[PDB]
Enzyme design. Structure first.
Site, PDB file in Angstrom:
ATOM      1  N   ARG B   7       0.824  -1.203   0.000  1.00  0.00           N
ATOM      2  CA  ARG B   7       0.000   0.000   0.000  1.00  0.00           C
ATOM      3  C   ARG B   7       0.859   1.254   0.000  1.00  0.00           C
ATOM      4  O   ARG B   7       1.654   1.419   0.920  1.00  0.00           O
ATOM      5  CB  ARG B   7      -0.894   0.096   1.233  1.00  0.00           C
ATOM      6  CG  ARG B   7      -1.761   1.364   1.202  1.00  0.00           C
ATOM      7  CD  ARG B   7      -2.519   1.509   2.511  1.00  0.00           C
ATOM      8  NE  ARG B   7      -3.082   2.836   2.630  1.00  0.00           N
ATOM      9  CZ  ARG B   7      -4.271   3.226   2.158  1.00  0.00           C
ATOM     10  NH1 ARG B   7      -5.097   2.401   1.512  1.00  0.00           N
ATOM     11  NH2 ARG B   7      -4.614   4.501   2.351  1.00  0.00           N
ATOM     12  N   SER B  61      -7.342  -0.199   1.923  1.00  0.00           N
ATOM     13  CA  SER B  61      -7.084  -0.957   0.725  1.00  0.00           C
ATOM     14  C   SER B  61      -5.591  -1.240   0.506  1.00  0.00           C
ATOM     15  O   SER B  61      -4.769  -0.356   0.787  1.00  0.00           O
ATOM     16  CB  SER B  61      -7.622  -0.182  -0.433  1.00  0.00           C
ATOM     17  OG  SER B  61      -8.039  -1.037  -1.491  1.00  0.00           O
ATOM     18  N   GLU B 110      -8.657  -3.681 -10.394  1.00  0.00           N
ATOM     19  CA  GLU B 110      -7.665  -3.250  -9.433  1.00  0.00           C
ATOM     20  C   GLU B 110      -7.268  -4.354  -8.491  1.00  0.00           C
ATOM     21  O   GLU B 110      -6.168  -4.302  -7.960  1.00  0.00           O
ATOM     22  CB  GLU B 110      -8.177  -2.088  -8.600  1.00  0.00           C
ATOM     23  CG  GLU B 110      -8.275  -0.836  -9.473  1.00  0.00           C
ATOM     24  CD  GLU B 110      -8.634   0.481  -8.777  1.00  0.00           C
ATOM     25  OE1 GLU B 110      -7.738   1.096  -8.188  1.00  0.00           O
ATOM     26  OE2 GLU B 110      -9.794   0.909  -8.852  1.00  0.00           O
ATOM     27  N   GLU B 112      -8.231  -5.309  -5.207  1.00  0.00           N
ATOM     28  CA  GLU B 112      -7.843  -4.823  -3.898  1.00  0.00           C
ATOM     29  C   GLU B 112      -8.043  -5.904  -2.856  1.00  0.00           C
ATOM     30  O   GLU B 112      -8.911  -6.779  -3.012  1.00  0.00           O
ATOM     31  CB  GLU B 112      -8.680  -3.656  -3.540  1.00  0.00           C
ATOM     32  CG  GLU B 112      -8.672  -2.705  -4.698  1.00  0.00           C
ATOM     33  CD  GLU B 112      -9.262  -1.351  -4.432  1.00  0.00           C
ATOM     34  OE1 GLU B 112     -10.251  -1.238  -3.719  1.00  0.00           O
ATOM     35  OE2 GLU B 112      -8.695  -0.395  -4.933  1.00  0.00           O
TER      36      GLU B 112
END
Ligand SMILES: OC[C@H]1O[C@@H](O)[C@H](O)[C@@H](O)[C@H]1O
Ligand SMILES: OC[C@H]1O[C@@H](O)[C@H](O)[C@@H](O)[C@H]1O
Ligand SMILES: OC[C@H]1O[C@@H](O)[C@H](O)[C@@H](O)[C@H]1O
Ligand SMILES: OC[C@H]1O[C@@H](O)[C@H](O)[C@@H](O)[C@H]1O
Ligand SMILES: OC[C@H]1O[C@@H](O)[C@H](O)[C@@H](O)[C@H]1O
Lengths: 103, 188, 45, 103, 103, 103, 103
Positions: B7, B61, B110, B112
């Protein structure tokens, strides 16, 4: 010897199993004369005590009473769930004889 | 999947240390109970903040690769001279968003993995500093990571995630499988 | 319907408090100091 | 036996309940002769001690004084909020008789 | 009773306060005969000891000496910041009389 | 009185300083009669013991032996790195007299 | 002295090594008269006890029974995997003689 808390609890008179399966809500500890004890409560409302050491306790229990109070302090602080309690039900609040935790 | 998640975040190591980890929006200490927070996976996956990789509605996330997280950081934290990419271990506070929300996943591409409640500092393996968009690739390890504990842990299964998916009460997802079998009360 | 959403809220919070207990069992246990019970009791009761 | 710290505190003279609801700000521990004690303070500036064992303590209280010192150390370190304190107020700083904390 | 470490330190001869405001850099523990003791060191170069129990210690100090070494082991292991030390300065390394921690 | 583990280890016959600079690989604890000991090993292959209390230990060491076994259980569980060990090399496995941890 | 749990365990009648390589599933602690004991179970269904102190225990084992219960409680709370147990098998549940853990 007993293999489970339920097996140990029914060899004593005046005991019963409470299935709690929750963490302690509150912990009280007293060092005041004649009330050197721990009291714990659950969300559900039950209040339980570790008894002041006294004439009814044999010598081997005087040592296990101090171990129990240490277990309850760190169980409370880390929010670990107690599964069951075996209590003597002839005391107010009821008196802890044995605890189990799982997972 | 490999046991690390990634992240990009502008919040520096010692602030994260003070907050007790990587916190969602508006939560300041990991163990704070009084700052009651909205936690909803669906609303979290659909939201966008400026200057933050998705961290609202109770989840934070993360990405599956250093590359994706870096791409995320370059799009979102671009003005910053220094931001960090935290390396995080898998554990059951993490849920795979495409797996829990299924076809209703907002941003499938994406991929996540979101941490319910934030990421405790002891779960952060280490971090890379990013300077002017360039990753300094020398990993700084986190002294307080619990190596033995986190060693063998995994993402939470999607199953555990279904009753927490957070779809609105009228969303047809609560009427179909697999969510129907896990709908909270009043959903459906 | 509020009940859906506050249920969602309530279950996610439960899920969170329980994961926070696993973390507290890790970091609070480094402060646990053991007692020599025999010398503590060795004066009385 | 009492079921709450308020009920317990009431059995003694010169006591008072404090509603703290805060974590300990500082912990002082001493091993200097005749000051073997612990002092804790709160951001409010309230200061409390665990007394040196003395003539006013009965025998059963001496192992409970030790336990209370152990509880205050781990409560400080973990930054656990104390709910209420039962204290003897004829002492400066006031001394702890009992402590309670709630999750 | 004293309300702070500065105030307690001052009741003793040959004591001094050291404002540390830092974690312990190293912990040494020995069980070698006549060297049952702990030595701690800080970044700034200061070294302090908890003394071996001896004739200088009145009997109330003995449980307190063991507590201080339990506190220093925990403080070292968890990198807890120490605020001030009260030490006797007529010993090499200087002996810890009391310790305070803040936040 | 010693300033460091190497100065301390110097005062005894049959000692050696091992620089480990690693965390414990394994911990074994025994409560078998006449075998009440702790054995630790390192990735490099070295094995050390805290010996059973026998005739060679003076009485001051009795508490110290229990503390050392406590330090070794919690050093293992926190995965803390050990710097140096001062050991008696006249025993197999070598016997721990003192430990050093740093940072 | 032994260098491994298998060496130490093979020095006793009625012992057996079990390799668990898992964390404790449940922990039960009792303070009830003549059953002051700890019972642990694992996911694979095995149950073991630390037995009550008795005439079969020499004095050096009395403090070792208490350290074993402190070890089981802390490795239950930290979910630390136990590698092997050395147990006496002439007891039901099998009684723990030694434990080892590694990572
Ligand atoms: O071992 C402690 C127990 O002893 C019994 O004699 C008593 O009836 C119980 O209430 C409990 O005090
Ligand atoms: O038992 C401890 C307490 O004993 C009382 O008699 C005294 O007045 C209190 O201040 C406190 O010391
Ligand atoms: O109480 C412990 C202290 O006792 C004093 O008599 C001595 O001068 C100090 O250095 C310290 O040993
Ligand atoms: O204090 C313990 C030590 O005592 C010594 O005399 C002995 O030679 C060492 O092996 C060690 O046992
Ligand atoms: O000292 C502990 C052991 O003592 C033995 O004599 C007994 O057979 C074992 O089952 C165990 O109790």
């Amino acid at each position: 010897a007993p293999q489970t808390i339920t097996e140990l609890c029914s060899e004593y008179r005046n005991t019963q199993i409470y299935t709690i399966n929750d963490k302690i809500l509150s912990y009280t500890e007293s060092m005041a004369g004649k009330r050197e004890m721990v009291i714990i409560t659950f969300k559900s409302g039950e209040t339980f005590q570790v008894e002041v050491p006294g004439s009814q306790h044999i010598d081997s229990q005087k040592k296990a009473i101090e171990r129990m109070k240490d277990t309850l302090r760190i169980t409370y602080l880390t929010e670990t769930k107690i599964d069951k309690l075996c209590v003597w039900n002839n005391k107010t609040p009821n008196s802890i004889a044995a605890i189990s935790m799982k997972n | 999947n490999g046991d690390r998640l990634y992240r990009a975040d502008s919040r520096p190591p010692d602030e994260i240390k003070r907050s007790g980890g990587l916190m969602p929006r508006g939560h300041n200490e990991y163990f704070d109970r009084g700052t009651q927070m909205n936690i909803n996976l669906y609303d979290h996956a659909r939201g966008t903040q400026t200057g933050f990789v998705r961290y609202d509605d109770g989840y934070v996330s993360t990405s599956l690769s250093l590359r994706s997280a870096h791409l995320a950081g370059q799009s979102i934290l671009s003005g910053y001279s220094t931001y960090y990419i935290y390396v995080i271990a898998t554990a059951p506070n993490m849920f795979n968003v495409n797996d829990v929300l299924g076809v209703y996943s907002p941003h499938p591409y994406e991929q996540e993995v979101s941490a319910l409640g934030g990421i405790p500092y002891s779960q952060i393996y280490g971090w890379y500093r990013v300077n002017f968009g360039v990753i300094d690739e020398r990993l700084h390890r986190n002294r307080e990571y619990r190596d033995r504990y986190y060693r063998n842990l995994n993402i939470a299964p999607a199953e555990d995630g279904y009753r927490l998916a957070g779809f609105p009460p009228d969303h047809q997802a609560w009427r179909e499988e697999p969510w129907i079998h896990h709908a909270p009360q009043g959903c459906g | 319907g509020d009940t859906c959403n506050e249920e969602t809220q309530n279950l996610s919070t439960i899920y969170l408090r329980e994961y926070q207990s696993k973390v507290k069992r890790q970091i609070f246990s480094d402060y646990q100091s053991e007692v020599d019970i025999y010398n503590r009791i060795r004066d009385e009761l």
